[PDB]
Amino acid sequence: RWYPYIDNGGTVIGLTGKDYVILAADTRLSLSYSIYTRFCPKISKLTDKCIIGSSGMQSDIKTLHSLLQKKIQLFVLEHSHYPDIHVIARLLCVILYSRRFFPYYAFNILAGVDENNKGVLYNYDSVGSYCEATHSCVGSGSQLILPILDNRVEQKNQLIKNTNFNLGDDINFVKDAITSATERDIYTGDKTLIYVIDKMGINVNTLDLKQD
Amino acid sequence: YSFSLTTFSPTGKLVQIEYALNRVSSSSPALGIRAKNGVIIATEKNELIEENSIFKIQQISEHIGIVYAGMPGDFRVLLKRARKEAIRYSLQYGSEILVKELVKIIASIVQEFTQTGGVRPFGLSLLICGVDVYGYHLYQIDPSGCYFNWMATCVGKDYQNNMSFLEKRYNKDIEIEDAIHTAILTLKENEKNIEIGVAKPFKILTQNEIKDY
Amino acid sequence: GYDLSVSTFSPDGRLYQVEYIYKSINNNNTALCLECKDGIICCCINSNMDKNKMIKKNSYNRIYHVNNNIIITYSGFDGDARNIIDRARSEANTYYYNFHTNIPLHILVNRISLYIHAYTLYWHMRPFAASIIISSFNEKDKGDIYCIEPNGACYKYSGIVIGKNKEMFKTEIEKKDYKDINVRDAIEDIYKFILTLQNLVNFSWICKESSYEFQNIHEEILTPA
Amino acid sequence: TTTLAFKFKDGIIVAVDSRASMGSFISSQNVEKIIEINKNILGTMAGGAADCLYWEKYLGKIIKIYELRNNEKISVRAASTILSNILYQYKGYGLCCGIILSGYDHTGFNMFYVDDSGKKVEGNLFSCGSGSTYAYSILDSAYDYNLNLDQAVELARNAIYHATFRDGGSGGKVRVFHIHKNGYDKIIEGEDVFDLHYHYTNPEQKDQYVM
Amino acid sequence: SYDRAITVFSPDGHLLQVEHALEAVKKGGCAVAIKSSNFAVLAVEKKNIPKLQNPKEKLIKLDEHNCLAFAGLNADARVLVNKTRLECQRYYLNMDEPAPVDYIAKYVAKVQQKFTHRGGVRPFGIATLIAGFKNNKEICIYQTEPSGIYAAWKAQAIGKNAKIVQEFLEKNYQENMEQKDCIFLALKAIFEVVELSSKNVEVALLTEKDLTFIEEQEINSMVELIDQER
Amino acid sequence: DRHLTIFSPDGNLYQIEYAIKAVKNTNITSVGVKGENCAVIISQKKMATKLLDYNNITNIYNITDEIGCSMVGMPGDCLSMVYKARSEASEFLYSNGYNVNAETLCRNICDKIQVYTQHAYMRLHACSGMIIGIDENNKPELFKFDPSGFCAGYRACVISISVLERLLTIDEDIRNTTILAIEALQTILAFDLKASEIEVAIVSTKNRNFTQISEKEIDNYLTYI
Amino acid sequence: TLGPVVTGTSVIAIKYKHGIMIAADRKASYGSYAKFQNVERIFKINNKTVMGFSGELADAQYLHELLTRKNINNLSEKKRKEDMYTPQHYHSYVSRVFYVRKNRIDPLFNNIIIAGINSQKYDNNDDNVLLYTEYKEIHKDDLYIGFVDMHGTNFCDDYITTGYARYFALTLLRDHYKDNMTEEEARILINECLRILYFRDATSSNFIQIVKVTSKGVEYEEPYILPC
Amino acid sequence: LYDTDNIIYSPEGRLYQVEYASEAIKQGTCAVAIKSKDYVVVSGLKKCISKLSFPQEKIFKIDDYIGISMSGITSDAKVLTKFMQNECLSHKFLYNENINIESLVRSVADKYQKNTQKSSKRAFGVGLMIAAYHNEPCIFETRPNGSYFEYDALSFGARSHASKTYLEKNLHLFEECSLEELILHCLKALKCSLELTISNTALAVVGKNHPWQEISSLQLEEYLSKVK
Amino acid sequence: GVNTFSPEGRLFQVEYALGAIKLGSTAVGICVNDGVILASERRISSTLIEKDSVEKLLSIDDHIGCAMSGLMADARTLIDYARVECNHYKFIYNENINIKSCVELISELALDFSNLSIMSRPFGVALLIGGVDKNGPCLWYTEPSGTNTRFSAASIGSAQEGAELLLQENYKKDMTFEQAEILALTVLRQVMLSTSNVEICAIKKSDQTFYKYNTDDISRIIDVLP
Ligand SMILES: CCONC(=O)N1CCC[C@H](C(=O)N[C@@H](C)c2nc(-c3ccc(C#N)cc3)cs2)C1
């Protein structure tokens, strides 16, 4: 028999501030202890204030992102306005649940800045269960990064606090997080793309990581 | 686009059935006579046309034969359907089909085209002859879809006069030979015109056999 | 009152809808196909839209091709003609699906003529308003030219004209035998018969200079002719 | 998961946890399990999160269309029947849903338990999830009909705390809502079970608690 | 005419088949409905040849609590009533509560509109008077036309000579009233058009428990009282 | 109203008469003649009604290697009936694994025609057909049908009847049957016939396959007479 | 297909100065048996697009005939040279075909390479397309090489290897490949890669077909034997 | 008798129902469209039945570089607008490139004439003006009888003869004129059809490195001031 | 033929259906910045009819209302379809439908009889659909021809022309919500007044919620007529 599922690896990290969202993702593509290519982006643009990143099977990810972009464009052509991140969130939930009995093997993070200039991150499993979060991570490395983000962002086991968070410090923190992901995860590596949305639009930066 | 072409007249008449009745009335005659030990059906009808290929009398099954008055193509499709229904009953119940059940099935099929949308009634009247455990059977089916159980009957052109002649001549206790002679007498009102089928299994009498009679 | 449906024979035994389609096609633009020694030359004269000066120059082309070596042109309505042309393309594609070879021309002619004929039977379908010239040329077989009438007929020619002014164009092209004339020497005579200006004409041919494949005249060969 | 509803003198109490663990790994401890189906009926999530969320929102749209057509609020019984029939239509497909629908209608305060296998049971004290047995133990030990609102609130909080304490798959925060005639109230929007442990069982905080 | 428009707009703007269905309804026998505090009374004319026809049905018990009385074509009424009963049980299966009168009146009106709109069907040549109880336990009566429009009524009449009985009911309905007074009002109202006799009417009282038919002796006594009055 | 295929008040169906008139209006004649061990059809090679390809015009057709036919009437209807006959023979061969008879094929074709005869929504095919072929007993068969959907076997037939009546070794039998067909057509048309405007087709026990003799042989037979 | 029977081996493809160079050995193996050794494995889609496969031969022939009829369908609706479909369009079509087949659990047992030239500006080849009968330096961004997988996952790179070449030839390409490589340098690099594949792969062969997609169209070089 | 149903040809050889559908185009408001070497500008009149009524939308977006104007029945125009939008977005989803305008216009013309064959259906009582920049500016007219035509300039609707005369006078200047000059020519043609209030005139542009975009109110007021 | 055309290019059935929408009780709708209001006349033919059972105004959604005229049963079908589609949108996208999009859905179903791409004839109803969305309040008129029209204020029913003239003569853009209320009552008074004679509904920009008027609200604006 033929099993119609593969895991292409990689990782996608997401963070939000009071007035911004950062979404990092590696650009490695791997079958099983092999490298298809060293540049396969995982994050896609939906509107001028929203992005979706995802990890899992690459064909499912690409088809899902193209279909979701097509649906948002049809929405804009029909309803004469651009949907908020919450509207796109419910739409993505319905689209993923439509294949409930043969699911998209893709775990997604939908990042954006909403009507109120408030950063919003919605994390999604394969079958459309989803929720809002301050920080999230999906892909191979996620079990590494998520304790780090829980420690730094919402420190619970620490008796004295320091919550002086800003855009530059958060960018450096996400860079350190993806760097630590590369060290201890075989499927994370190569270049990584970091997308930032604060008040005006999307700004993309790139960072080389370990090529092994 | 499925609408009934046959429609009730203001005087409560299906005139399409009446016109099909007129068509079969204008067609060449046929008749059937039932004896105590047999049943006979006979016909009436260029020097280039082959006589073998235009037999109006046809066999549905081993003890069921058929003759018609009206259109040839309608008769051919109805004969194919009758043979299919007889084969269906033989495959299901094993035994050869009864005359009455076949007549009822064909009558229902003929009535269906009187009511189905986008079709016209059959332009012929059939006569089934047959034999089974309940004796000999002669049944006339009209364009209307009504089946009539007869001792002897005539269909087609001048059928009233032929019915009068046969009614004067017919007796219940006649033989096969006497019935064949009376059929030829009724058809007289040459050798190649008449063709006779008698039902022992159903058979078509060859030209010499009609010649001696 | 027998002419108000394609699915009824008149007491004369005629289908009047087909005759009215013939009149409609005869009222439409002219199209020629001609069989020359090295190729077949086909053309169309779009003079009915001479009044419309807003049209983009040399854009309305009634000449189409199938499998790069079968010219197909029409005279009639545009949408019905596009149905016929797309059906011809689909039939050629199906023949290549099954058999890995290009469809023969006469089998395509029979199939498309049957497709046209299928609409002249039922009472709930409009018959095709188009007369179709389908043709090809080969080094061995020379030029095969077929005209499919709206009635489902299909006839092979050594030269055909359809559309308006077909009688004058037929008697003009009948004057000289083109089996010993090349296409370049024929375009001049075709222009002379069209006169009896140059942005309301379309042309094509399948000769050896095009390697026996579909083409249109470049402006540099149009002009000196 | 641990969800626990129960009727009492002034109305209904509902209480839930907030985890969404994927096997052993905890995915999120801030999940909303009391889905507001409409302004009077309240939902509750257990088992598969995707199925519960989708079908409770579908029941919400169905109830809204019904109430707009007929111009009257639906009953808890009718909503339970619609949900149970919809879930039974997907028998043999692998759904996993355990839902407790509580609410107020013209018949009164009504509570029902519905399952992905077409179950529908009418009661006054329900609990679902992996930690349902522990919450059942605490509730059936301490439940009384004539409790005040605060007494029922602390009872529900204690039951949820004990369920999260014993059960590996329950914890995070506790959310406790109160349903009354005119609607419902979020008595506890969210509260860490860390403080619940170090308040209830280990107030001294001088050594590790021996179970 | 499998899928064809039998009913279409006229040059003025009317759907002529709907008015023809109304004309068919005008031939049907008179049927009167009167409401009270927690009960209703439906009285419908019956016509039958004496000594030959079995007296044993224009009134119907639709479900546990609803009841119906039609006027128009009888076979159309029978099939519409069977559909209504099927929908009553379908609602009671799909909601686990009995169907309210408002819901089933809406469904009957919707079905009549649907047959007034779909291709290849004829309008229902019947007007209807449904009586029943709502979710809040109040009783009410809904009258439904062949044109798909319904409306609730305190008291109403349908069928032949409906205008005379309607304008008689207007000047005699008195809000809540006793069962005896309600039945007597129904008798004298429907008898303003049909002949004064005991066998020309069947009357039934709808209560929360069940629809009870009034025996012929009581109807004959009330007919005698009416005859003595006039 | 004679538009539909329904009964007139006298019981007649006038659409079949109108279709038969349509077939007769083509002015196309074909004579079929059976022999001792062979059968011939001779048809007239002209368009139904200068540059036209006259070799392409034909009324005879090859339904199978053994069975062949000649259709007369509307050309699209003729081609459609040819394709129906080929499909019928192919279906018979697939289901049964042996070649259909001319008789059985004619039966099935008229069974198909009866559907159009009875159904109001179907136009009738203005087509008469004359099929020939050898049977399994090694004897010829000549069957003929008309738009009415009625078939019959003939010793000889035309699509005049008395001209054939007075006229009516394997090689000698084939030669005599071909001469009889040619002389019958010549006498019916009553003008001298050129070999380039008629078409003869033959089936025989010697050569089971349907085949048409060349123009040289027709010229030889005409010069013989 | 339920699984592979007559299988084709690896394919290599790179960009260079004048266009695309794609190489495949002409062997198809029936299990562990060289039943066929003259099999054309690289297909010409159109004048600026070629395809290669590694996997079951029947599925590859089916896909090739599909893309062929798509090319004639495109040509039938042609008016100018810019109407022609680029390798990007065919790559997207093959990706959608493989994805749809993957949804039904009924794949084409193949890994496909689609390669060619994107832009039409370097020549007027498609002014008069003929089917039955010095180079130009093309920029890397105007060339196209793309991988398509059995699960439908797809991508593009400057050099694609499919089959067993993903381990043996991919290493040498990732070491030695450079931009603006000459035709001779590309040829010797590809020959070295195929030599290593022939030595270390059982199913491979030393009878190569090279196809060049350059400014003067698609060019099938005559097949040759790898020395040593 | 010959115009009761759409499938009956007249004795002259005419389909009266299709011609009535084509006659329904003239009742719509005037629209004009012109182009040059680079840009296309389409202008139109927004119908305003009363002062309390807002003007009716006249121009619609189809793609990033395609837009339409309509004349006729508005429901038919909405149906065809939805069809074109789904076709463009489906092409953008299946393949990663813009749809060809020739194929899209052929598809819309096929969708028109499919309804003119079956007797159950009726012809589309709406004429379409599709403006786009695929590789160059282009304007397409589509009529109810299944035909479509390219146009250098185009206009139709109520009182469109005067604007057509203006276009016939001034066609030779449009190719070399600048974008603002082209907008002034289109607005002058629209005035010649007739008062050009800010509400009652719709106008949009599409061209090289310029997606489809309705000109704003302030810019429209500036251009209308420049019309004199 | 239901789908046949006229020589003037106008569909016969749509033209005939336009004659039906004139018949009916008069209703009016006014849009201001504060909100949108729809008032409607009741037809109390006799005292036996229960007044509240017949309702000319109603909700298509929580944030949308409508005033309908013509053939009422067709209107009930259309509003049922609109309610289902609006709640489907709210499920699929988790927000409120625009009034233009809902009006376009209702118009798309209106000419379903044509079968260009199932109903058999046109609808015989006209709808003034009002409501508040992110773009503020608005009011859209739709008719059997399938055309939609955004209106500042509009009227439907028998006395369409007189109400239209009175609206045109006595409407201002920046008028207060109470000013629009007295405008609606004055227009309906001139067309034809007490509680249960007219039914009024409002959707405000502050609340964006349907609100059917009742006793002490109908009389309040009746008490401040000029
Ligand atoms: C090939 C895919 O690579 N493997 C992967 O991505 N893994 C597996 C390991 C744990 C990761 C994880 O838990 N990531 C957190 C941020 C997430 N949380 C959710 C989620 C969704 C809905 C609810 C609700 N209600 C709660 C949580 C979705 S993802 C998810």
UniProtKB/TrEMBL annotation, chain A:
GO MF terms held by the record: hydrolase activity
Residue intervals passing through the bilayer: none
GO BP annotations, alphabetical order: proteasome-mediated ubiquitin-dependent protein catabolic process
Keywords: Cytoplasm, Hydrolase, Nucleus, Proteasome
Annotated localization: Cytoplasm; Nucleus
InterPro entries: Ntn_hydrolases_N (IPR029055), Proteasome_bsu_CS (IPR016050), Proteasome_sua/b (IPR001353), Proteasome_suB-type (IPR023333)
GO cellular component, one term: proteasome core complex, beta-subunit complex
Main location (coarse class): cytoplasm
CDD domains, sorted: proteasome_beta_type_1
Domain of life per record: Eukaryota
Family membership noted in the UniProt record: Belongs to the peptidase T1B family.
PANTHER family per the UniProt record, alphabetical: METALLOPROTEASE TLDD (PTHR32194), PROTEASOME SUBUNIT BETA TYPE-1 (PTHR32194:SF2)
Protein's job: Component of the proteasome, a multicatalytic proteinase complex which is characterized by its ability to cleave peptides with Arg, Phe, Tyr, Leu, and Glu adjacent to the leaving group at neutral or slightly basic pH. The proteasome has an ATP-dependent proteolytic activity.
Record's subunit section: Component of the proteasome complex.
Protein name: Proteasome subunit beta
Automatic annotation (TrEMBL), chain B:
GO annotation, biological process: proteasome-mediated ubiquitin-dependent protein catabolic process; ubiquitin-dependent protein catabolic process
Chief localisation class: cytoplasm
Membrane-spanning intervals of the chain: none
UniProt KW GTP-binding keyword: no
Proteasome alpha-type subunits domain location: 1-23
Signal peptide: none
Pfam entry (one): Proteasome_A_N
Keywords: Cytoplasm, Hydrolase, Nucleus, Proteasome
GO MF annotation list: endopeptidase activity
GO cellular component: cytoplasm; nucleus; proteasome core complex; proteasome core complex, alpha-subunit complex
Cellular localisation: Cytoplasm; Nucleus
Family: Belongs to the peptidase T1A family.
Record protein name field: Proteasome subunit alpha type-2
Organism (species): Plasmodium falciparum (isolate 3D7)
Phylogenetic lineage: Eukaryota, Sar, Alveolata, Apicomplexa, Aconoidasida
UniProtKB/TrEMBL annotation, chain E:
Cellular localisation: Cytoplasm; Nucleus
Keyword annotations from UniProtKB, A to Z: Cytoplasm, Hydrolase, Nucleus, Proteasome
Domain of life: Eukaryota
Claim: Lipid metabolism is one of the keywords in the record: no
SMART domains in the cross-refs: Proteasome_A_N
Domain Proteasome alpha-type subunits positions: 2-24
GO cellular component, as recorded: cytoplasm; nucleus; proteasome core complex; proteasome core complex, alpha-subunit complex
Pfam families in the record: Proteasome, Proteasome_A_N
GO molecular function: endopeptidase activity
Biological-process GO terms, alphabetical: proteasome-mediated ubiquitin-dependent protein catabolic process; ubiquitin-dependent protein catabolic process
Quaternary structure (record): The 26S proteasome consists of a 20S proteasome core and two 19S regulatory subunits.
Family according to the record: Belongs to the peptidase T1A family.
Name of this protein: Proteasome subunit alpha type
TrEMBL record, chain H:
Gene Ontology CC: cytoplasm; nucleus; proteasome core complex; proteasome core complex, alpha-subunit complex
Localization: Cytoplasm; Nucleus
Membrane-spanning residues: none
Keywords for this protein: Cytoplasm, Hydrolase, Nucleus, Proteasome
GO molecular function: endopeptidase activity
Domain of life: Eukaryota
Listed name of the protein: Proteasome subunit alpha type-1, putative
